[PDB]
């Protein structure tokens, strides 16, 4: 939860805070690249 101490732009008149979709896309890219690597590796051994 955003607080004065952990969020310097916090203005409560604007409601609760969430990651942006850029944060979502960057997490997805890291996760997809990582997991896909692990999978391809298993697929190369088994297939």
């Amino acid at each position: 939860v955003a607080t004065r101490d952990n969020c310097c732009i916090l203005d409560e008149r604007f409601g609760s805070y969430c990651p942006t979709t850029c944060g979502i896309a960057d997490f997805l890219n890291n996760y997809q690249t990582s997991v896909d690597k692990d999978l391809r590796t298993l697929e190369g051994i088994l297939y």
Binding site: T20, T21, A25, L28, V35, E43, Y47
Partner: protein
């Protein structure tokens, strides 16, 4: 016909949440399907 983004626009301008949910779901389906194929093979 919006202007094309520059690398500096990232984090100030971000994708649609519906687009991101579509991509998240596509990745989940690809991974679950690949995991099930590996499971079918191993045991």
């Amino acid at each position: 016909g919006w202007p094309f983004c520059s690398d500096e626009d990232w984090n100030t301008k971000c994708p649609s949440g519906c687009r991101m949910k579509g991509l998240i779901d596509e990745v989940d389906q690809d991974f679950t399907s690949r995991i099930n194929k590996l499971r079918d093979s191993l045991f």
